[PDB]
Each structure stands twice: as structure tokens, then as C-alpha cells.
XYZ file of C-alpha atoms in Angstrom:
25
model
C 20.223 3.793 25.156
C 18.395 0.523 24.521
C 15.044 -0.689 23.287
C 13.402 -1.268 26.658
C 13.624 2.286 27.838
C 13.384 3.461 24.253
C 9.778 2.292 24.235
C 9.189 4.198 27.407
C 10.481 7.056 25.410
C 8.311 6.147 22.492
C 5.416 5.635 24.932
C 6.124 8.957 26.526
C 6.770 10.534 23.168
C 3.245 9.706 22.014
C 1.754 11.069 25.227
C 2.654 8.424 27.778
C -0.086 8.058 30.439
C -1.982 10.799 28.623
C -2.043 8.617 25.517
C -3.688 5.608 27.133
C -1.273 2.758 26.538
C 0.339 1.016 29.503
C 3.967 1.820 30.383
C 6.475 -0.457 28.621
C 9.064 -2.653 30.299
């Protein structure tokens, strides 16, 4: 897809909001 979204993915992949880290843009 990209990298931008990909980090959302990666974010989400590691738990997203449940992980702790802020959403990537």
C-alpha cells in the first residue's frame, strides 16, 4: 500500500490504541 498507512497497520498490528502509542500519519 504505502508506508504511511503501513505504520497504521504496524500500529494496529501491535495493538493500536490498546498498545498505547499514538496513531501514525
